[PDB]
């Protein structure tokens with residue numbers, strides 16, 4: 124029922140340039156009833172909440188955490204989404220395989236959850252290994268997705284997940300159209316957002332992988348901002364003429 128569904132990652136997209144973050148929240152703060160806000164971050168819910176306290180993030184309507192593997196409504200965790208992602212998902216099997224790659228090191232336990240298996244790629248290892256991993260996991264027949272971002276972060280998620288799928292799920296839930304949705308991202312864990320039919324904005328300080336993606340799949344709904352961080356979101360809002 125609002126004119127805009129604003130979805131954005133936090134670190135180096137919403138957050139990173141304090142001044143830009145502040146004037147972005149000032150502008151939006153003056154028309155808070157005209158849009159739904161959702162943070163689509165790779166961080167866990169607790170880690171996101173912690174960031175909010177550090178930089179003073181404005182309270183969002185929804186939290187799409189751990190790359191969309193968990194969705195938090197004002198009232199709490201979405202159990203429908205969780206059961207949905209649990210169908211045919213085989214965490215143990217996938218983990219056993221991923222654990223077998225010398226080039227991969229598990230991320231801390233606090234970065235893992237039932238629907239997210241994360242690792243770090245060795246800075247000395249050849250990225251092509253990510254391809255070998257993807258192929259090997261897909262062939263198990265388990266609906267799995269491999270998310271590679273910032274040249275080091277690797278997330279194993281159900282196929283039904285990722286920021287984009289969580290976004291579409293949210294859009295349906297709020298009866299918001301893609302034409303009324305704006306996704307903002309900076310890295311490979313945002314590609315899912317741009318595979319969506321919503322309007323999208325790639326921040327100026329975007330990671331190499333996202334830019335490469337844009338070069339190959341960029342469409343007319345995708346905008347490459349001149350501004351970096353929060354500024355790109357204001358720039359995009361003016362570009363797609365949202366909150367007219």
Ligand SMILES: OC[C@H]1O[C@H](O[C@H]2[C@H](O)[C@@H](O)[C@@H](O)O[C@@H]2CO)[C@H](O)[C@@H](O)[C@@H]1O
Nearest residue numbers: 134165166167234241272276277278312
């Ligand atoms: O999906 C990529 C990656 O995202 C999250 O990582 C954050 C990290 O917690 C931050 O402190 C900062 O460094 O930026 C990262 C990129 O957003 C997840 O926490 C991580 O597990 C995941 O792989």
Ligand SMILES: [Mg+2]
Nearest residue numbers: 132309310313
């Ligand atoms: Mg990102």
